[PDB]
Amino acid sequence: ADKLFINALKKKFEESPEEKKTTFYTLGGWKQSERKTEFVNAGKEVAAKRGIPQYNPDIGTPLGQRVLMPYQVSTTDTYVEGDDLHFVNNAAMQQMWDDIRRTVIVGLNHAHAVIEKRLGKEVTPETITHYLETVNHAMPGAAVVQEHMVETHPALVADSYVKVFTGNDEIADEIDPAFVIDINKQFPEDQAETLKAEVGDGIWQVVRIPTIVSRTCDGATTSRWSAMQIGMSMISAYKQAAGEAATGDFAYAAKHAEVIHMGTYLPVRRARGENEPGGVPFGYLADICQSSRVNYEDPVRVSLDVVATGAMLYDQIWLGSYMSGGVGFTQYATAAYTDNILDDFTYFGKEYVEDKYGLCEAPNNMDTVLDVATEVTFYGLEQYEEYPALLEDQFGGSQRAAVVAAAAGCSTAFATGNAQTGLSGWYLSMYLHKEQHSRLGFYGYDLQDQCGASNVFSIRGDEGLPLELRGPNYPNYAMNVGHQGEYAGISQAPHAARGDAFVFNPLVKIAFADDNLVFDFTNVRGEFAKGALREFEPAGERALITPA
Amino acid sequence: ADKLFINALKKKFEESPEEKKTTFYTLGGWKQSERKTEFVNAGKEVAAKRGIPQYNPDIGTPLGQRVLMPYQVSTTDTYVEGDDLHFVNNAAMQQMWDDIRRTVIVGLNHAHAVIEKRLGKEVTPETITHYLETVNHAMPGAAVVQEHMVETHPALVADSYVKVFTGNDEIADEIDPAFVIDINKQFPEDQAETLKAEVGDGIWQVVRIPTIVSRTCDGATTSRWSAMQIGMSMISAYKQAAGEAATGDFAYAAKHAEVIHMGTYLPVRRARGENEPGGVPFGYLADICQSSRVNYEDPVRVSLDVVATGAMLYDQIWLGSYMSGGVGFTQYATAAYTDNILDDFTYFGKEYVEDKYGLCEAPNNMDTVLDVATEVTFYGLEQYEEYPALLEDQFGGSQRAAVVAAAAGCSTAFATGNAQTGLSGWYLSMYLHKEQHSRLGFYGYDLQDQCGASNVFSIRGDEGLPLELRGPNYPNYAMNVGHQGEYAGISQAPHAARGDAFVFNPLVKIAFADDNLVFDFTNVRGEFAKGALREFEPAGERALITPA
Amino acid sequence: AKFEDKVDLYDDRGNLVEEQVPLEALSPLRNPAIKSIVQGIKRTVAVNLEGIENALKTAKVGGPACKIMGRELDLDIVGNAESIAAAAKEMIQVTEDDDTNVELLGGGKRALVQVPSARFDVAAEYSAAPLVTATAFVQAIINEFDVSMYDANMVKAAVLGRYPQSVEYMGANIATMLDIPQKLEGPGYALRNIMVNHVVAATLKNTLQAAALSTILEQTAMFEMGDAVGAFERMHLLGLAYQGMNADNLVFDLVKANGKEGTVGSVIADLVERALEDGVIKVEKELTDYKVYGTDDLAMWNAYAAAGLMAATMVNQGAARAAQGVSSTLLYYNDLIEFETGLPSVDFGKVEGTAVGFSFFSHSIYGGGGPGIFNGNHIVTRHSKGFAIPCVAAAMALDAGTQMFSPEATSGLIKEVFSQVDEFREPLKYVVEAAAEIKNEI
Amino acid sequence: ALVQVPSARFDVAAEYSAAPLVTATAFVQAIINEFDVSMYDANMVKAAVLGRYPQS
Amino acid sequence: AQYYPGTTKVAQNRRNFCNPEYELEKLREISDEDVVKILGHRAPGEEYPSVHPPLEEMDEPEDAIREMVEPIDGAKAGDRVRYIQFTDSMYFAPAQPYVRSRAYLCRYRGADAGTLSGRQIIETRERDLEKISKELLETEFFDPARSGVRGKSVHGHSLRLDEDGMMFDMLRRQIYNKDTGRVEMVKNQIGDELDEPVDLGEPLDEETLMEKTTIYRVDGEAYRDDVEAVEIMQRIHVLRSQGGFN
Numbered sequence A, B: 001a002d003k004l005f006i007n008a009l010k011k012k013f014e015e016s017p018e019e020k021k022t023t024f025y026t027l028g029g030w031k032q033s034e035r036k037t038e039f040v041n042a043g044k045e046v047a048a049k050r051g052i053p054q055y056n057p058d059i060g061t062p063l064g065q066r067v068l069m070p071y072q073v074s075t076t077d078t079y080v081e082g083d084d085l086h087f088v089n090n091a092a093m094q095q096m097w098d099d100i101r102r103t104v105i106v107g108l109n110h111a112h113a114v115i116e117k118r119l120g121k122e123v124t125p126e127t128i129t130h131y132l133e134t135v136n137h138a139m140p141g142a143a144v145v146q147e148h149m150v151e152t153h154p155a156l157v158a159d160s161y162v163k164v165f166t167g168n169d170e171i172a173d174e175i176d177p178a179f180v181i182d183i184n185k186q187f188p189e190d191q192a193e194t195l196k197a198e199v200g201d202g203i204w205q206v207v208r209i210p211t212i213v214s215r216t217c218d219g220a221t222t223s224r225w226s227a228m229q230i231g232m233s234m235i236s237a238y239k240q241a242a243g244e245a246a247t248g249d250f251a252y253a254a255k256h257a258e259v260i261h262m263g264t265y266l267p268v269r270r271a272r273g274e275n276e277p278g279g280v281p282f283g284y285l286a287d288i289c290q291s292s293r294v295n296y297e298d299p300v301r302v303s304l305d306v307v308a309t310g311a312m313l314y315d316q317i318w319l320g321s322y323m324s325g326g327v328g329f330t331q332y333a334t335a336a337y338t339d340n341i342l343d344d345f346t347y348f349g350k351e352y353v354e355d356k357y358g359l360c361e362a363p364n365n366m367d368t369v370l371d372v373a374t375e376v377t378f379y380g381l382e383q384y385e386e387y388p389a390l391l392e393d394q395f396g397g398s399q400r401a402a403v404v405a406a407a408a409g410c411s412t413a414f415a416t417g418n419a420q421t422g423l424s425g426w427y428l429s430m431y432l433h434k435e436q437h438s439r440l441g442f443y444g445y446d447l448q449d450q451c452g453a454s455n456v457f458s459i460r461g462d463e464g465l466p467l468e469l470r471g472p473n474y475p476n477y478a479m480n481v482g483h484q485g486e487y488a489g490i491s492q493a494p495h496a497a498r499g500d501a502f503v504f505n506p507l508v509k510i511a512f513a514d515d516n517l518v519f520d521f522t523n524v525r526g527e528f529a530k531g532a533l534r535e536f537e538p539a540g541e542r543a544l545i546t547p548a
Numbered sequence C: 001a002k003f004e005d006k007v008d009l010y011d012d013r014g015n016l017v018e019e020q021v022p023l024e025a026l027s028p029l030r031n032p033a034i035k036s037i038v039q040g041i042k043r044t045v046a047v048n049l050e051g052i053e054n055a056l057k058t059a060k061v062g063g064p065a066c067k068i069m070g071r072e073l074d075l076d077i078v079g080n081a082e083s084i085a086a087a088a089k090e091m092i093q094v095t096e097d098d099d100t101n102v103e104l105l106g107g108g109k110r111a112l113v114q115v116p117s118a119r120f121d122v123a124a125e126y127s128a129a130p131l132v133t134a135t136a137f138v139q140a141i142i143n144e145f146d147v148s149m150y151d152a153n154m155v156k157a158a159v160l161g162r163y164p165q166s167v168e169y170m171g172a173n174i175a176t177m178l179d180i181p182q183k184l185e186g187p188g189y190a191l192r193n194i195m196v197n198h199v200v201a202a203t204l205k206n207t208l209q210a211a212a213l214s215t216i217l218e219q220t221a222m223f224e225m226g227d228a229v230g231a232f233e234r235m236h237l238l239g240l241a242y243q244g245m246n247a248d249n250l251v252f253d254l255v256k257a258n259g260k261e262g263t264v265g266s267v268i269a270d271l272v273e274r275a276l277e278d279g280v281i282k283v284e285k286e287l288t289d290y291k292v293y294g295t296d297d298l299a300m301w302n303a304y305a306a307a308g309l310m311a312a313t314m315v316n317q318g319a320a321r322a323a324q325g326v327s328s329t330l331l332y333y334n335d336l337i338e339f340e341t342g343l344p345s346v347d348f349g350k351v352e353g354t355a356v357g358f359s360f361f362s363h364s365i366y367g368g369g370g371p372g373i374f375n376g377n378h379i380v381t382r383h384s385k386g387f388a389i390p391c392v393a394a395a396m397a398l399d400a401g402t403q404m405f406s407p408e409a410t411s412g413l414i415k416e417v418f419s420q421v422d423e424f425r426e427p428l429k430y431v432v433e434a435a436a437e438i439k440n441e442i
Numbered sequence D: 001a002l003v004q005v006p007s008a009r010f011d012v013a014a015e016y017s018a019a020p021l022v023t024a025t026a027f028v029q030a031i032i033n034e035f036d037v038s039m040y041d042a043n044m045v046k047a048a049v050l051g052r053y054p055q056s
Numbered sequence E: 001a002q003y004y005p006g007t008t009k010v011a012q013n014r015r016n017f018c019n020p021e022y023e024l025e026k027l028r029e030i031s032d033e034d035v036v037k038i039l040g041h042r043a044p045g046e047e048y049p050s051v052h053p054p055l056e057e058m059d060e061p062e063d064a065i066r067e068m069v070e071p072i073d074g075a076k077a078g079d080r081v082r083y084i085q086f087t088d089s090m091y092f093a094p095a096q097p098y099v100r101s102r103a104y105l106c107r108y109r110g111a112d113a114g115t116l117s118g119r120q121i122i123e124t125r126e127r128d129l130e131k132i133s134k135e136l137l138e139t140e141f142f143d144p145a146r147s148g149v150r151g152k153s154v155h156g157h158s159l160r161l162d163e164d165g166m167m168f169d170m171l172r173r174q175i176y177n178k179d180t181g182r183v184e185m186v187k188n189q190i191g192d193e194l195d196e197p198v199d200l201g202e203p204l205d206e207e208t209l210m211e212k213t214t215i216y217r218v219d220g221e222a223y224r225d226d227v228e229a230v231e232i233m234q235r236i237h238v239l240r241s242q243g244g245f246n
């Protein structure tokens, strides 16, 4: 009955959500906040211990002349100060990125062809199982051939392993199930059938290297580390000479011919290797998120779990640290996963579409874009106008622009079943919002926004691309907060409405359907809340090798 | 006197080091080793916990048919199994890299000029001190201007700060010494005079971003994070509009026009941004190591502390993980920093040169190369022939090639005062060694070796460069273990013999003269030993924000 | 022939040069002066002999603050410049009477080098210019002074810097208007990675010539990128003609009419009136006291609007004599004109979007800098397909001294050498002349 | 199809990427024009020809 | 010029702010000295600092464009470029962020205008900025309760009003005096205390705010009911979309 953000607004402020007036300047600044108080005390201790001043609440301007708000993590009952959602302060957020960065998908199809056609040896489920036992010893950093090798401590690298999957049920069932991602167990029936049809008789590894290594090094380490230990394990398990000409075919296959990186490398101004956030296309991010296989009866929930995944990764870690840093961009992102606000607006749009068209029944054209995106934009903006507490909550125009346009673009794609018209609706939302309030976002917010309408349906070299293939390196998108995670949600929206098992890469979808990951990709917002509460247990720590 | 490696050989084996025969196969394989036993036990616990087999001593071949040796960290009396020198298992090694990766040097010279010209405002030691209070609050991730900012937890980011240095004693002496790297205090008088003359009236920031951020992100984050918080602190401390046209000059200066990265970005095949190991030139690595300002009466100690720094970073973390992974390359590197072996050979060469020519007094020519590098190569190789325990210790040809040639190249540079003839002596050592023993290193060891002589003195586009400017991205050097850290040592050698305060960049030398670093760059080998013993305390851990 | 359009061409004083020139006579694909400019920019290098000499004498090689104590070499390079340059030329040329040029400037402190065009005809790209020039001068210096095998690597480092350890020629004492191929944001972008300040320096701050050079480079890149192939070709050619070539004296006349007292808004009003007078737009619909305009020729509307955009920059930043507001002009000219007319702005919103980001990235902490450090390859300013950066060049030409990162700060070596070249300095003149010459071959 | 892009395009180009870029867009446009592919669908033609560029 | 479509009071007010022939209503008198104090760039009696020498002292070559474009007075002198920045409440302030930038580039010469949600800025040569700023401060561009002059710490455009009807200001630069019912500026725009406060007059009453505002809201005039203004925005979207394709 009540709008979904009402409970959160009543938690934040003494006044009712509709009340236009308040009183400021009475809360003692930072002293109102448990968290700021913890920080003041911690800064005193840090500075005293190290002999260099550090956090000081009297430098610059005095925070907390207004209420420093708690935020409800959407879909949860957890309320936290926003500092607990900063990626630096949230081990779940850090582990979510580590789990992506340290994963690669590596075929065994060329490799098995090299074994059969070149070594002249048979491959069967039994030989695959022996290989998998071998590579699960080797992958975390342990030896299989040479004498006098020194190895990683198994407990520091407990999170590293290799699993496989295949669309052939009878082959899957013959490999030892300790190593298999079971598509039939993880996915509902129709999605499982779709995914198994995509994979067919292909056999793919999901390799996760150690978090401690990924943190020491970078994302471009992942496919190399994977290949080295695949290589050693092919030597040991199939009885090669330990370094013969055929050894190089396994190297080329695992490093290049049948590897799938999570992210592609970046150009020099933003130089980075593979498996960094900017190289992860929006359709892969939607596929990494596992909401699709557990919340499939609710396409809004699926889509907004993807928005949460992407707003955090792309705005907080990527744009707010890799591409900038400092205090960063916590609340640019939290606006899309807190207080059930985006949820309220997107359920409105979903229901509007159900009533007028039926999901995926609207014509895939500009008429539908104009209808849906305009209606949903106006609903969202009316909520800020009706509820002064809501407007004071999402106080930055960029935050409001992203939230309103995400609901409009997801709703448009719920109607058409096509992400490209969803994207057109996102841009129309921005144009209407700008004219309604005579403001939009920060100084640079609508660079992509004003290029946006013309580039949705362009076909030119560096302009034309289906939304699912776009990502943080699409030129117009390469700089700015409040867009990338929302685009991942729009990419997910029509596929969730259609009941599709994946958005852009079925191997990526399957590769994260795995409870051996450290972060639980089925419930991204629940994990963010667990990390905010300091209740998440990450991998990669050095406690075992440092003083007690 | 005993050769310097005799104590270590006596610790490793029951036989005296000269004895030619032993007995094998009696030690119980892995069961001889405390460390391997720890690993076997951990592997069983890991596999049970997660439901996937992991470390298992019965996979592949049975380690420990010979003695699994302890290693003496050279210059210490610490003896450890080699697994305690693997970077994954050694928090000192990880922190050494984090401390480099998370550092950038950023001028204040353009910034102070923007203030005086575009803004028309004064800069004085007092405005600088206020700016430094401000930036030391902001840099770790805390706010100075906006309301309702959410911040990093000061205790998570206690390792991040900003200092300054300048050749102008008047300003250096007047700033709170909390913020100053004091050249007069950190360097002996002659070195201090050289360094101050290089810097002149320039003022430079040394910015260290948080280890937790560097681990979550990458090296290319560092200069961005630095610039954001310098930018905010310039706005707050000098009363700009918070975002006017002049703000952009501060950004361009801090990001591009007056920044010194530790490493430059890499070509696509090995795509990486700035502040990754492959981008760090050999002369910078020598300058990062701080042995030069403490051990200057002993050029061998300075040169071999640089070799230790580089062998670990370049072979273990860079080539052994970023560029490969797995078990990796611990002992390719430990050969250059254990058992006092390189030290024995290099002290022999230094004595040879000091007696025959006097340090830095030999002609800088091929005659000196032929004399010195030949004599030192034959000394090193003779030791392996006279001490069977030494040969069984440095069992891989690559290890021996690197160690003998490092001694020969450093000694040649001690004679000529010029790194380029040092490098020619390195390659000559390899050619002589190959002929003497009818072997050199691993299958690919001497790619650079065989190109080597011809490219030492080339002037062509991608061939010609003084050694100090070379690094891991010099084409011939881009792939292979057992060279890069040794080349950093050769780059250091003539400057250490000459008494020069730095090898290639004085700003980099000064920037690591700072006891507020987590790792102690004055005593790299001592630090590696402390990490091996599990006694080093790294930054960056998440314990404060995770459960008990 | 493919297009029926004709344009009248003028000089930089607003005088008619040639009437009724076919549009394709200005195409990069047809106009021989644009070909000569582009091949000239590929092949030309500035060599700083004084800088090489000083780097050697101090051993300050390999990038900012770098120095190798003990490696100093004191060579009388500038005093022997004539000999060194002649010896370099003999290695650089292909044959003795080809188009290789090696010319000393500044009493031998600098050299202009133009590597023969024939090396490029058998090259994939343009890096032969710096690489052939660099090695020829390294070898000529070594040979002039009989520099030993032991020392010659310092000469190499003084000339070309830390390459190949660095990907760029880090610390080099040679310069080009182009930058290395690895720095392209996309394939086809090389003529876009030319700093605005370098264009302004080469054209000696003449506003119309700076805008012309920038437009020629930008729109030529649009051909190399494929953007000006097929459906879009006429749009790009008309942009080149009207925004960068002052076709029909439209830019000039708008500035004349608005220069004394005008604003961005007054220029918009005049451009809309002119488009109406010329039949480019017409009233489609009447709302309540508001005329909705339409066009049957979107490429032509775009071109008129682009000429107005350039004029608005010249009026707004010319009145301030301060370039920073170009980002604001680029934004609000386009935002205002859409609400004035009901027609799309220049480049169908892509100028306005480029301007939003460019404004942010020239007034914030996050990146960018002053207008002169941008270019068509910069991530902030790549998005419009040629219609934004020429205005930035016009604005920087009009800046009277408000920038720290001015062309005097960033582009002095380039200015000394590249402004010597007549077709780089005064391209509008040469391109108009070539168009008039080939007018009957189209 | 064998395609050889005219040499004159290269004489006024910095490098060689005009070959794939001019070819790709000519074939994208020719396919769209052959079948009257709609504005809503034409981006898939582009993807089929040139792939994930410019995200990759 | 027609400036903006629509049939609401909002739309007419947007057109009036852009139209340089519309006489902005003057609501309050402020002295020259007080404009200078509020700007905070120079002290009373301080000569204009310069960033470069006067144009006349320069040896500029012939340039037809330069010759045709008259420099503003501060450009002739070599004045620094300085700024004034305003925050407008979403509770019916008269001016709003895009309204300002659009209007400034219609009305003023040599102007660098920037729009953001919480702040809007103009940068120009200092002496010219002082003349423009007087008009921005004295006229219906400004209300002293629902608008604020703020060079930093701008938060408040989207906040609830206080009990006096004043917008939030973290730095409390503008203080409502119950005894006069007038607002005083007690700090300059960057937040430094003024020697003596500047009278900014009375806040506009609710009726007058509604007559003068340029924001559309459900509790004022809703944008969705200004169907002609929505039609033009939709038209723009569609024409840009089609144009980018073919």
Ligand code: F43
Binding pocket: A138, A142, A143, A144, A145, A146, A147, A149, A150, A228, A229, A232, A235, A242, A243, B325, B326, B327, B328, B329, B330, B331, B332, B333, B395, B396, B397, B398, B399, B440, B441, B442, B443
């Ligand atoms: C399979 C290869 C071919 C290849 O591509 N890499 C190998 C194996 C690889 C694996 C071995 C781990 C394991 O046992 O599972 C690792 C550790 C790299 C990784 N994947 O983590 C490695 N070599 Ni190898 N590799 C080494 C070496 C060597 C020496 C060993 C000679 C001897 O007499 O023992 C020889 C080359 C040579 O003859 O010069 C060698 C060969 C080989 N090297 C032969 C296997 C030799 C054998 O069958 O025993 N390495 C060394 O010479 C010392 C350093 C040592 C590395 C580990 C460390 O640095 O601690 C290891 C470095």
Ligand code: F43
Binding pocket: A325, A326, A327, A328, A329, A330, A331, A332, A333, A395, A396, A397, A398, A399, A440, A441, A442, A443, B142, B143, B144, B145, B146, B147, B149, B150, B228, B229, B232, B235, B242, B243, C363, C364, C365, C366, E116, E117, E118, E119, E151, E152, E153, E154, E155, E156, E157, E158
């Ligand atoms: C100095 C700038 C200019 C610049 O380049 N970045 C700033 C400041 C920067 C700093 C502020 C930290 C601090 O206070 O020390 C950080 C956190 C980036 C960093 N260096 O870590 C940031 N902005 Ni800003 N920035 C934000 C925002 C905004 C909104 C705030 C409007 C309001 O009414 O409060 C406006 C732009 C707009 O008007 O639309 C804004 C401006 C500005 N942004 C103005 C300062 C405004 C002021 O004087 O108060 N940001 C937002 O709209 C919300 C998210 C928020 C970011 C922090 C987070 O995401 O948690 C922060 C993101």
Ligand SMILES: C[C@@H](OP(=O)(O)O)[C@H](NC(=O)CCCCCCS)C(=O)O
Binding pocket: A269, A270, A319, A320, A323, A324, A444, A478, A479, A480, A481, B224, B255, C361, C366, C367, C368, C369, C379, C380
């Ligand atoms: C523009 C560019 O900066 P430069 O102009 O190259 O310094 C780029 N930064 C950014 O895009 C900043 C993005 C994150 C901060 C702003 C988010 S709205 C980068 O560092 O490569």
Ligand SMILES: O=S(=O)(O)CCS
Binding pocket: A442, A443, A444, B243, C360, C363, C364, C365, E116
């Ligand atoms: O004020 S800005 O738009 O430049 C930065 C917002 S975080």
Ligand SMILES: O=S(=O)(O)CCS
Binding pocket: A243, B442, B443, B444
């Ligand atoms: O055997 S190889 O030389 O190929 C690898 C040595 S680690």
Ligand SMILES: [K+]
Binding pocket: A214, A215, A216, A217, A218, B214, B215, B216, B217, B218
């Ligand atoms: K990392």
Ligand SMILES: [Mg+2]
Binding pocket: A053
């Ligand atoms: Mg103090």
Ligand SMILES: [Mg+2]
Binding pocket: A515, A520
């Ligand atoms: Mg679980």
Ligand SMILES: [Mg+2]
Binding pocket: B173, B174, B175, B176, B177
């Ligand atoms: Mg003191």
Ligand SMILES: [Mg+2]
Binding pocket: B515, B520
């Ligand atoms: Mg210490």
Ligand SMILES: [Mg+2]
Binding pocket: B518, B520
């Ligand atoms: Mg210590």
Ligand SMILES: [Mg+2]
Binding pocket: C146, C147, C148, C149
């Ligand atoms: Mg000679």
Ligand SMILES: [Mg+2]
Binding pocket: C286, C289
């Ligand atoms: Mg009428």
Ligand SMILES: [Mg+2]
Binding pocket: E029, E030, E031, E032
């Ligand atoms: Mg008066």
